[PDB]
A paper describes a structure:
In contrast, Lys49-PLA2 lacks phospholipase activity, or exhibits minimal phospholipase activity because the catalytic Asp49 is substituted for Lys4–6. In this study, we comprehensively analyzed basic protein II (BPII), which is one of the Lys49-PLA2 homologues isolated from the venom of Protobothrops flavoviridis (PflLys49-PLA2 BPII).
The crystal structure of PflLys49-PLA2 BPII was determined at a resolution of 2.57 Å. The asymmetric unit contained four molecules of PflLys49-PLA2 BPII. These four molecules were superimposed well relative to each other with root-mean-square-deviation (r.m.s.d.) values less than 0.5 Å for the Cα-atoms. The relative orientation between molecules A and B was similar to that between molecules C and D. However, this dimer was superimposed neither on the conventional dimer nor the alternative dimer previously reported. Furthermore, basic residues were located on both sides of the interface, and the surface charges of both interfaces were positive. The area of the interface among four molecules was less than 350 Å2. However, all cysteine residues formed intramolecular disulfide bonds in the crystal structure, and thus, intermolecular disulfide bond formation is highly unlikely.
Residue numbers in the entry: 1 to 122
The structure:
Amino acid sequence: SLVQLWKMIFQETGKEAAKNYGLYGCNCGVGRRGKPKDATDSCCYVHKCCYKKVTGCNPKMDSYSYSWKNKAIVCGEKNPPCLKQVCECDKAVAICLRENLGTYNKKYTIYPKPFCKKADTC
């Protein structure tokens, strides 16, 4: 669920997830999609697009089972198809988030999403 993702974000980024990425760019956090602003927003772009490949669940409400191993995210204990995927979706968006931390814009942290150009289809 979305609380798990928020934790997941913090554990690889060290920043409070909703505080820093809840309104970042045009695809991070609540709201729709847009043409991404930077690599930080674009990995939120990838997250929302793997989130549409979910089938039988509510990712923002349904929790899953996962653990935080030797600084490595292991969702890999047996999970139902969706709950496996969203959590892998969350881990992938948690992992890339650490990969573009040097790019993070402090001005994009709360971004006016309506003004962003509409994203294509994933």
